[PDB]
Amino acid sequence: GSVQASDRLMKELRDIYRSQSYKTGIYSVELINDSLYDWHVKLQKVDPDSPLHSDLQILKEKEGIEYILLNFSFKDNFPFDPPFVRVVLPVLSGGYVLGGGALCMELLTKQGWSSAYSIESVIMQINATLVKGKARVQFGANKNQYNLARAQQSYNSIVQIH
């Protein structure tokens, strides 16, 4: 990585760990492999009135899982380039989620990303936008259709037409 990226990523984590949204358990953050550049982020409280909330209760009954697990991956040039954010599980339809689990949200593109955004704000926006876009769980869905490679391929396809 880089000193600039790492400095910023540590500041983001620190801000998250002191934030109210984190304190009240809306979402969780953990590093993967102790890498500042790779994070588990679980969306744990989605709009309780949404069908997504209802679907996650069914999933909890089925699989013990009542959350959406996201993966955030950062590059050397962060915060000038956005994090790459993708869904790990469960498989979703709608909600601005693409094949492979990429997210098609303007804040995450080169057009919409600003270093003015905290990572806390990014996590909360994603939560709101899944609900706004009517995300639903795909219950019959092939496990392992989501991974970095396939998410990158979808995101690359969008840049060609966006």
Side-chain angles (χ1 to χ4, degrees):
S2 74
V3 153
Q4 302 283 111
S6 289
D7 283 337
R8 181 55 185 272
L9 283 166
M10 291 167 268
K11 189 198 76 197
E12 294 290 0
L13 290 168
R14 195 208 309 148
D15 291 333
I16 282 151
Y17 286 134
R18 304 157 83 16
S19 70
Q20 283 312 297
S21 55
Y22 180 91
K23 218 105 300 89
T24 64
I26 291 174
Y27 63 84
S28 68
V29 178
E30 307 288 345
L31 305 184
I32 311 173
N33 209 33
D34 214 41
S35 172
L36 270 171
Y37 291 87
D38 308 82
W39 302 11
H40 297 311
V41 173
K42 293 188 286 176
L43 304 184
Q44 299 174 326
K45 300 179 163 173
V46 308
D47 184 339
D49 288 314
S50 59
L52 183 58
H53 179 82
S54 188
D55 284 2
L56 292 172
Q57 306 319 305
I58 301 171
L59 192 73
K60 184 189 178 166
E61 169 89 28
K62 279 176 89 78
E63 312 200 353
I65 297 180
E66 54 183 303
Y67 54 78
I68 300 167
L69 173 65
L70 315 169
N71 182 260
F72 278 59
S73 74
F74 302 89
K75 279 209 143 60
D76 293 352
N77 195 41
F78 183 74
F80 308 131
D81 297 311
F84 188 85
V85 184
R86 66 188 176 81
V87 179
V88 180
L89 63 84
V91 178
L92 306 169
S93 57
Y96 296 90
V97 183
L98 304 177
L103 296 177
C104 199
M105 304 184 184
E106 284 284 355
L107 88 168
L108 287 175
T109 63
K110 86 202 79 190
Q111 294 66 38
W113 171 252
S114 176
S115 64
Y117 297 151
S118 55
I119 302 305
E120 177 200 357
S121 178
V122 173
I123 293 166
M124 297 297 286
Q125 271 313 115
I126 282 164
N127 198 345
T129 301
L130 292 171
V131 168
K132 174 156 156 176
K134 287 174 51 180
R136 304 296 305 262
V137 176
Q138 284 196 55
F139 287 104
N142 321 252
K143 293 215 157 218
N144 224 352
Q145 56 173 278
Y146 284 180
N147 59 44
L148 183 66
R150 292 177 40 148
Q152 290 169 338
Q153 170 186 335
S154 291
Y155 180 87
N156 292 348
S157 295
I158 61 145
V159 323
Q160 289 193 306
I161 62 163
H162 179 245

PDB file of all heavy atoms in Angstrom, residues 32-59:
ATOM      1  N   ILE A  32      -9.752  -8.011   7.475  1.00  0.00           N
ATOM      2  CA  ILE A  32      -9.476  -9.361   7.020  1.00  0.00           C
ATOM      3  C   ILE A  32      -7.956  -9.545   6.978  1.00  0.00           C
ATOM      4  O   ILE A  32      -7.237  -8.740   6.380  1.00  0.00           O
ATOM      5  CB  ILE A  32     -10.020  -9.619   5.647  1.00  0.00           C
ATOM      6  CG1 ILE A  32     -11.484  -9.164   5.536  1.00  0.00           C
ATOM      7  CG2 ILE A  32      -9.874 -11.111   5.294  1.00  0.00           C
ATOM      8  CD1 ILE A  32     -11.978  -9.261   4.103  1.00  0.00           C
ATOM      9  N   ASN A  33      -7.474 -10.604   7.619  1.00  0.00           N
ATOM     10  CA  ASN A  33      -6.033 -10.934   7.617  1.00  0.00           C
ATOM     11  C   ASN A  33      -5.175  -9.830   8.211  1.00  0.00           C
ATOM     12  O   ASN A  33      -3.977  -9.720   7.905  1.00  0.00           O
ATOM     13  CB  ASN A  33      -5.540 -11.299   6.214  1.00  0.00           C
ATOM     14  CG  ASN A  33      -4.359 -12.271   6.248  1.00  0.00           C
ATOM     15  OD1 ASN A  33      -4.266 -13.124   7.142  1.00  0.00           O
ATOM     16  ND2 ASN A  33      -3.454 -12.140   5.281  1.00  0.00           N
ATOM     17  N   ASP A  34      -5.795  -9.046   9.090  1.00  0.00           N
ATOM     18  CA  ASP A  34      -5.176  -7.867   9.673  1.00  0.00           C
ATOM     19  C   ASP A  34      -4.724  -6.853   8.600  1.00  0.00           C
ATOM     20  O   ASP A  34      -3.713  -6.154   8.773  1.00  0.00           O
ATOM     21  CB  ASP A  34      -4.007  -8.262  10.597  1.00  0.00           C
ATOM     22  CG  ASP A  34      -3.862  -7.323  11.785  1.00  0.00           C
ATOM     23  OD1 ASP A  34      -4.882  -6.923  12.375  1.00  0.00           O
ATOM     24  OD2 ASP A  34      -2.710  -6.977  12.132  1.00  0.00           O
ATOM     25  N   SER A  35      -5.451  -6.787   7.485  1.00  0.00           N
ATOM     26  CA  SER A  35      -5.100  -5.843   6.429  1.00  0.00           C
ATOM     27  C   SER A  35      -5.983  -4.626   6.522  1.00  0.00           C
ATOM     28  O   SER A  35      -7.200  -4.732   6.530  1.00  0.00           O
ATOM     29  CB  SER A  35      -5.211  -6.476   5.040  1.00  0.00           C
ATOM     30  OG  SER A  35      -5.045  -5.494   4.019  1.00  0.00           O
ATOM     31  N   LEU A  36      -5.363  -3.451   6.589  1.00  0.00           N
ATOM     32  CA  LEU A  36      -6.118  -2.199   6.671  1.00  0.00           C
ATOM     33  C   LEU A  36      -6.919  -1.986   5.397  1.00  0.00           C
ATOM     34  O   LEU A  36      -7.813  -1.182   5.387  1.00  0.00           O
ATOM     35  CB  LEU A  36      -5.136  -1.004   6.799  1.00  0.00           C
ATOM     36  CG  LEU A  36      -4.691  -0.525   8.172  1.00  0.00           C
ATOM     37  CD1 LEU A  36      -3.551   0.498   7.962  1.00  0.00           C
ATOM     38  CD2 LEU A  36      -5.861   0.070   8.987  1.00  0.00           C
ATOM     39  N   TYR A  37      -6.499  -2.656   4.313  1.00  0.00           N
ATOM     40  CA  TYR A  37      -6.983  -2.459   2.947  1.00  0.00           C
ATOM     41  C   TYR A  37      -8.129  -3.421   2.569  1.00  0.00           C
ATOM     42  O   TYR A  37      -8.589  -3.402   1.414  1.00  0.00           O
ATOM     43  CB  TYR A  37      -5.829  -2.667   1.941  1.00  0.00           C
ATOM     44  CG  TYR A  37      -4.784  -1.582   2.028  1.00  0.00           C
ATOM     45  CD1 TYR A  37      -3.721  -1.685   2.937  1.00  0.00           C
ATOM     46  CD2 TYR A  37      -4.898  -0.417   1.257  1.00  0.00           C
ATOM     47  CE1 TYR A  37      -2.758  -0.649   3.052  1.00  0.00           C
ATOM     48  CE2 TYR A  37      -3.947   0.629   1.375  1.00  0.00           C
ATOM     49  CZ  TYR A  37      -2.893   0.492   2.269  1.00  0.00           C
ATOM     50  OH  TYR A  37      -1.970   1.511   2.367  1.00  0.00           O
ATOM     51  N   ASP A  38      -8.529  -4.291   3.513  1.00  0.00           N
ATOM     52  CA  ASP A  38      -9.601  -5.287   3.271  1.00  0.00           C
ATOM     53  C   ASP A  38     -10.456  -5.439   4.514  1.00  0.00           C
ATOM     54  O   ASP A  38      -9.936  -5.817   5.574  1.00  0.00           O
ATOM     55  CB  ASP A  38      -9.045  -6.650   2.858  1.00  0.00           C
ATOM     56  CG  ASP A  38      -8.086  -6.562   1.705  1.00  0.00           C
ATOM     57  OD1 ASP A  38      -6.897  -6.253   1.971  1.00  0.00           O
ATOM     58  OD2 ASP A  38      -8.510  -6.794   0.551  1.00  0.00           O
ATOM     59  N   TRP A  39     -11.752  -5.103   4.403  1.00  0.00           N
ATOM     60  CA  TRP A  39     -12.670  -5.098   5.555  1.00  0.00           C
ATOM     61  C   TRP A  39     -13.943  -5.979   5.352  1.00  0.00           C
ATOM     62  O   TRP A  39     -14.549  -5.910   4.293  1.00  0.00           O
ATOM     63  CB  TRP A  39     -13.231  -3.715   5.784  1.00  0.00           C
ATOM     64  CG  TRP A  39     -12.279  -2.538   6.046  1.00  0.00           C
ATOM     65  CD1 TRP A  39     -10.916  -2.503   5.908  1.00  0.00           C
ATOM     66  CD2 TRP A  39     -12.683  -1.227   6.437  1.00  0.00           C
ATOM     67  NE1 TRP A  39     -10.444  -1.234   6.235  1.00  0.00           N
ATOM     68  CE2 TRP A  39     -11.511  -0.441   6.564  1.00  0.00           C
ATOM     69  CE3 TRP A  39     -13.925  -0.646   6.740  1.00  0.00           C
ATOM     70  CZ2 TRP A  39     -11.555   0.915   6.935  1.00  0.00           C
ATOM     71  CZ3 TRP A  39     -13.968   0.708   7.115  1.00  0.00           C
ATOM     72  CH2 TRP A  39     -12.784   1.459   7.223  1.00  0.00           C
ATOM     73  N   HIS A  40     -14.348  -6.736   6.387  1.00  0.00           N
ATOM     74  CA  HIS A  40     -15.722  -7.274   6.516  1.00  0.00           C
ATOM     75  C   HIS A  40     -16.635  -6.195   7.023  1.00  0.00           C
ATOM     76  O   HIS A  40     -16.375  -5.613   8.071  1.00  0.00           O
ATOM     77  CB  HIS A  40     -15.783  -8.405   7.567  1.00  0.00           C
ATOM     78  CG  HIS A  40     -14.964  -9.623   7.235  1.00  0.00           C
ATOM     79  ND1 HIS A  40     -15.020 -10.250   6.010  1.00  0.00           N
ATOM     80  CD2 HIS A  40     -14.125 -10.373   8.001  1.00  0.00           C
ATOM     81  CE1 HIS A  40     -14.241 -11.322   6.028  1.00  0.00           C
ATOM     82  NE2 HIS A  40     -13.701 -11.428   7.230  1.00  0.00           N
ATOM     83  N   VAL A  41     -17.726  -5.905   6.327  1.00  0.00           N
ATOM     84  CA  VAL A  41     -18.704  -4.987   6.870  1.00  0.00           C
ATOM     85  C   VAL A  41     -20.080  -5.629   6.806  1.00  0.00           C
ATOM     86  O   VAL A  41     -20.569  -5.900   5.709  1.00  0.00           O
ATOM     87  CB  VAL A  41     -18.753  -3.645   6.062  1.00  0.00           C
ATOM     88  CG1 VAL A  41     -19.918  -2.761   6.563  1.00  0.00           C
ATOM     89  CG2 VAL A  41     -17.392  -2.888   6.208  1.00  0.00           C
ATOM     90  N   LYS A  42     -20.685  -5.852   7.964  1.00  0.00           N
ATOM     91  CA  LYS A  42     -22.017  -6.481   8.007  1.00  0.00           C
ATOM     92  C   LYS A  42     -23.087  -5.436   8.233  1.00  0.00           C
ATOM     93  O   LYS A  42     -23.001  -4.642   9.180  1.00  0.00           O
ATOM     94  CB  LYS A  42     -22.112  -7.525   9.133  1.00  0.00           C
ATOM     95  CG  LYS A  42     -21.267  -8.757   8.956  1.00  0.00           C
ATOM     96  CD  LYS A  42     -21.604  -9.822  10.037  1.00  0.00           C
ATOM     97  CE  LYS A  42     -21.066  -9.490  11.397  1.00  0.00           C
ATOM     98  NZ  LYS A  42     -21.480 -10.490  12.430  1.00  0.00           N
ATOM     99  N   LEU A  43     -24.087  -5.401   7.354  1.00  0.00           N
ATOM    100  CA  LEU A  43     -25.274  -4.610   7.595  1.00  0.00           C
ATOM    101  C   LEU A  43     -26.225  -5.393   8.456  1.00  0.00           C
ATOM    102  O   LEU A  43     -26.822  -6.364   7.972  1.00  0.00           O
ATOM    103  CB  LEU A  43     -25.960  -4.252   6.281  1.00  0.00           C
ATOM    104  CG  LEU A  43     -25.154  -3.525   5.208  1.00  0.00           C
ATOM    105  CD1 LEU A  43     -26.041  -3.168   4.029  1.00  0.00           C
ATOM    106  CD2 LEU A  43     -24.493  -2.213   5.795  1.00  0.00           C
ATOM    107  N   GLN A  44     -26.424  -4.931   9.699  1.00  0.00           N
ATOM    108  CA  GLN A  44     -27.085  -5.735  10.737  1.00  0.00           C
ATOM    109  C   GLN A  44     -28.484  -5.250  11.044  1.00  0.00           C
ATOM    110  O   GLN A  44     -29.285  -5.998  11.577  1.00  0.00           O
ATOM    111  CB  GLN A  44     -26.242  -5.723  12.024  1.00  0.00           C
ATOM    112  CG  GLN A  44     -24.858  -6.320  11.834  1.00  0.00           C
ATOM    113  CD  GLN A  44     -23.963  -6.186  13.048  1.00  0.00           C
ATOM    114  OE1 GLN A  44     -24.031  -5.197  13.799  1.00  0.00           O
ATOM    115  NE2 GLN A  44     -23.100  -7.162  13.242  1.00  0.00           N
ATOM    116  N   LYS A  45     -28.767  -3.973  10.757  1.00  0.00           N
ATOM    117  CA  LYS A  45     -30.101  -3.400  10.937  1.00  0.00           C
ATOM    118  C   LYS A  45     -30.517  -2.702   9.660  1.00  0.00           C
ATOM    119  O   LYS A  45     -29.983  -1.639   9.338  1.00  0.00           O
ATOM    120  CB  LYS A  45     -30.115  -2.359  12.081  1.00  0.00           C
ATOM    121  CG  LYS A  45     -29.720  -2.915  13.449  1.00  0.00           C
ATOM    122  CD  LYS A  45     -29.736  -1.807  14.533  1.00  0.00           C
ATOM    123  CE  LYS A  45     -29.753  -2.396  15.943  1.00  0.00           C
ATOM    124  NZ  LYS A  45     -29.591  -1.331  17.024  1.00  0.00           N
ATOM    125  N   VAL A  46     -31.423  -3.296   8.897  1.00  0.00           N
ATOM    126  CA  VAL A  46     -31.939  -2.611   7.690  1.00  0.00           C
ATOM    127  C   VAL A  46     -33.350  -2.121   8.013  1.00  0.00           C
ATOM    128  O   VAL A  46     -33.923  -2.574   9.000  1.00  0.00           O
ATOM    129  CB  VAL A  46     -31.931  -3.507   6.395  1.00  0.00           C
ATOM    130  CG1 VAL A  46     -30.580  -4.139   6.149  1.00  0.00           C
ATOM    131  CG2 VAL A  46     -33.009  -4.554   6.461  1.00  0.00           C
ATOM    132  N   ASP A  47     -33.905  -1.208   7.208  1.00  0.00           N
ATOM    133  CA  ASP A  47     -35.218  -0.582   7.492  1.00  0.00           C
ATOM    134  C   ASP A  47     -36.251  -1.650   7.902  1.00  0.00           C
ATOM    135  O   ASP A  47     -36.602  -2.503   7.090  1.00  0.00           O
ATOM    136  CB  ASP A  47     -35.684   0.198   6.241  1.00  0.00           C
ATOM    137  CG  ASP A  47     -36.994   0.965   6.440  1.00  0.00           C
ATOM    138  OD1 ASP A  47     -37.791   0.654   7.345  1.00  0.00           O
ATOM    139  OD2 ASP A  47     -37.240   1.897   5.639  1.00  0.00           O
ATOM    140  N   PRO A  48     -36.743  -1.613   9.161  1.00  0.00           N
ATOM    141  CA  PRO A  48     -37.572  -2.731   9.655  1.00  0.00           C
ATOM    142  C   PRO A  48     -38.911  -2.880   8.925  1.00  0.00           C
ATOM    143  O   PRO A  48     -39.582  -3.904   9.063  1.00  0.00           O
ATOM    144  CB  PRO A  48     -37.805  -2.378  11.126  1.00  0.00           C
ATOM    145  CG  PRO A  48     -37.686  -0.903  11.180  1.00  0.00           C
ATOM    146  CD  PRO A  48     -36.587  -0.560  10.183  1.00  0.00           C
ATOM    147  N   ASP A  49     -39.265  -1.874   8.136  1.00  0.00           N
ATOM    148  CA  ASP A  49     -40.490  -1.886   7.351  1.00  0.00           C
ATOM    149  C   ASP A  49     -40.310  -2.476   5.962  1.00  0.00           C
ATOM    150  O   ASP A  49     -41.308  -2.720   5.270  1.00  0.00           O
ATOM    151  CB  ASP A  49     -41.035  -0.471   7.202  1.00  0.00           C
ATOM    152  CG  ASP A  49     -41.625   0.073   8.499  1.00  0.00           C
ATOM    153  OD1 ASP A  49     -42.393  -0.670   9.170  1.00  0.00           O
ATOM    154  OD2 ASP A  49     -41.317   1.241   8.837  1.00  0.00           O
ATOM    155  N   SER A  50     -39.054  -2.697   5.550  1.00  0.00           N
ATOM    156  CA  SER A  50     -38.778  -3.166   4.191  1.00  0.00           C
ATOM    157  C   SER A  50     -38.980  -4.665   4.047  1.00  0.00           C
ATOM    158  O   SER A  50     -38.778  -5.429   4.999  1.00  0.00           O
ATOM    159  CB  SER A  50     -37.357  -2.809   3.749  1.00  0.00           C
ATOM    160  OG  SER A  50     -36.411  -3.388   4.623  1.00  0.00           O
ATOM    161  N   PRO A  51     -39.378  -5.104   2.839  1.00  0.00           N
ATOM    162  CA  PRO A  51     -39.384  -6.531   2.562  1.00  0.00           C
ATOM    163  C   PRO A  51     -37.999  -7.164   2.754  1.00  0.00           C
ATOM    164  O   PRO A  51     -37.914  -8.325   3.143  1.00  0.00           O
ATOM    165  CB  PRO A  51     -39.815  -6.591   1.090  1.00  0.00           C
ATOM    166  CG  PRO A  51     -40.648  -5.362   0.934  1.00  0.00           C
ATOM    167  CD  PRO A  51     -39.872  -4.326   1.689  1.00  0.00           C
ATOM    168  N   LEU A  52     -36.918  -6.421   2.476  1.00  0.00           N
ATOM    169  CA  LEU A  52     -35.565  -6.956   2.757  1.00  0.00           C
ATOM    170  C   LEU A  52     -35.455  -7.416   4.218  1.00  0.00           C
ATOM    171  O   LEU A  52     -34.897  -8.481   4.502  1.00  0.00           O
ATOM    172  CB  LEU A  52     -34.461  -5.917   2.424  1.00  0.00           C
ATOM    173  CG  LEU A  52     -32.993  -6.385   2.610  1.00  0.00           C
ATOM    174  CD1 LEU A  52     -32.656  -7.636   1.747  1.00  0.00           C
ATOM    175  CD2 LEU A  52     -32.035  -5.222   2.274  1.00  0.00           C
ATOM    176  N   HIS A  53     -35.990  -6.632   5.156  1.00  0.00           N
ATOM    177  CA  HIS A  53     -35.935  -6.997   6.588  1.00  0.00           C
ATOM    178  C   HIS A  53     -36.674  -8.314   6.798  1.00  0.00           C
ATOM    179  O   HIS A  53     -36.197  -9.229   7.476  1.00  0.00           O
ATOM    180  CB  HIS A  53     -36.541  -5.891   7.470  1.00  0.00           C
ATOM    181  CG  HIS A  53     -36.545  -6.221   8.929  1.00  0.00           C
ATOM    182  ND1 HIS A  53     -35.436  -6.051   9.733  1.00  0.00           N
ATOM    183  CD2 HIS A  53     -37.511  -6.739   9.721  1.00  0.00           C
ATOM    184  CE1 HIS A  53     -35.726  -6.440  10.961  1.00  0.00           C
ATOM    185  NE2 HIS A  53     -36.981  -6.856  10.982  1.00  0.00           N
ATOM    186  N   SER A  54     -37.853  -8.396   6.206  1.00  0.00           N
ATOM    187  CA  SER A  54     -38.644  -9.623   6.257  1.00  0.00           C
ATOM    188  C   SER A  54     -37.853 -10.807   5.686  1.00  0.00           C
ATOM    189  O   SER A  54     -37.807 -11.881   6.296  1.00  0.00           O
ATOM    190  CB  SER A  54     -39.917  -9.424   5.438  1.00  0.00           C
ATOM    191  OG  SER A  54     -40.792 -10.530   5.610  1.00  0.00           O
ATOM    192  N   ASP A  55     -37.219 -10.619   4.514  1.00  0.00           N
ATOM    193  CA  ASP A  55     -36.439 -11.709   3.891  1.00  0.00           C
ATOM    194  C   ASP A  55     -35.299 -12.179   4.791  1.00  0.00           C
ATOM    195  O   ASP A  55     -34.973 -13.363   4.851  1.00  0.00           O
ATOM    196  CB  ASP A  55     -35.839 -11.255   2.552  1.00  0.00           C
ATOM    197  CG  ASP A  55     -36.866 -11.200   1.421  1.00  0.00           C
ATOM    198  OD1 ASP A  55     -38.064 -11.479   1.663  1.00  0.00           O
ATOM    199  OD2 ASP A  55     -36.472 -10.880   0.281  1.00  0.00           O
ATOM    200  N   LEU A  56     -34.661 -11.239   5.485  1.00  0.00           N
ATOM    201  CA  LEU A  56     -33.528 -11.609   6.337  1.00  0.00           C
ATOM    202  C   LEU A  56     -33.933 -12.434   7.565  1.00  0.00           C
ATOM    203  O   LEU A  56     -33.129 -13.212   8.092  1.00  0.00           O
ATOM    204  CB  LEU A  56     -32.723 -10.362   6.747  1.00  0.00           C
ATOM    205  CG  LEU A  56     -31.995  -9.709   5.550  1.00  0.00           C
ATOM    206  CD1 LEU A  56     -31.394  -8.374   6.054  1.00  0.00           C
ATOM    207  CD2 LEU A  56     -30.892 -10.593   4.935  1.00  0.00           C
ATOM    208  N   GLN A  57     -35.163 -12.257   8.008  1.00  0.00           N
ATOM    209  CA  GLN A  57     -35.723 -13.078   9.118  1.00  0.00           C
ATOM    210  C   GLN A  57     -35.905 -14.522   8.652  1.00  0.00           C
ATOM    211  O   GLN A  57     -35.649 -15.478   9.394  1.00  0.00           O
ATOM    212  CB  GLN A  57     -37.049 -12.490   9.628  1.00  0.00           C
ATOM    213  CG  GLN A  57     -37.021 -11.020  10.040  1.00  0.00           C
ATOM    214  CD  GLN A  57     -35.772 -10.629  10.797  1.00  0.00           C
ATOM    215  OE1 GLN A  57     -35.436 -11.238  11.818  1.00  0.00           O
ATOM    216  NE2 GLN A  57     -35.065  -9.617  10.299  1.00  0.00           N
ATOM    217  N   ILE A  58     -36.334 -14.681   7.400  1.00  0.00           N
ATOM    218  CA  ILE A  58     -36.468 -16.004   6.811  1.00  0.00           C
ATOM    219  C   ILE A  58     -35.118 -16.663   6.662  1.00  0.00           C
ATOM    220  O   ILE A  58     -34.939 -17.808   7.034  1.00  0.00           O
ATOM    221  CB  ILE A  58     -37.230 -15.956   5.458  1.00  0.00           C
ATOM    222  CG1 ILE A  58     -38.629 -15.355   5.676  1.00  0.00           C
ATOM    223  CG2 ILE A  58     -37.258 -17.322   4.813  1.00  0.00           C
ATOM    224  CD1 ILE A  58     -39.422 -15.054   4.366  1.00  0.00           C
ATOM    225  N   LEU A  59     -34.133 -15.918   6.152  1.00  0.00           N
ATOM    226  CA  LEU A  59     -32.789 -16.404   6.084  1.00  0.00           C
ATOM    227  C   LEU A  59     -32.206 -16.809   7.452  1.00  0.00           C
ATOM    228  O   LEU A  59     -31.434 -17.759   7.535  1.00  0.00           O
ATOM    229  CB  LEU A  59     -31.898 -15.329   5.419  1.00  0.00           C
ATOM    230  CG  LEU A  59     -30.505 -15.747   5.002  1.00  0.00           C
ATOM    231  CD1 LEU A  59     -30.624 -16.636   3.776  1.00  0.00           C
ATOM    232  CD2 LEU A  59     -29.660 -14.495   4.704  1.00  0.00           C
TER     233      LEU A  59
END
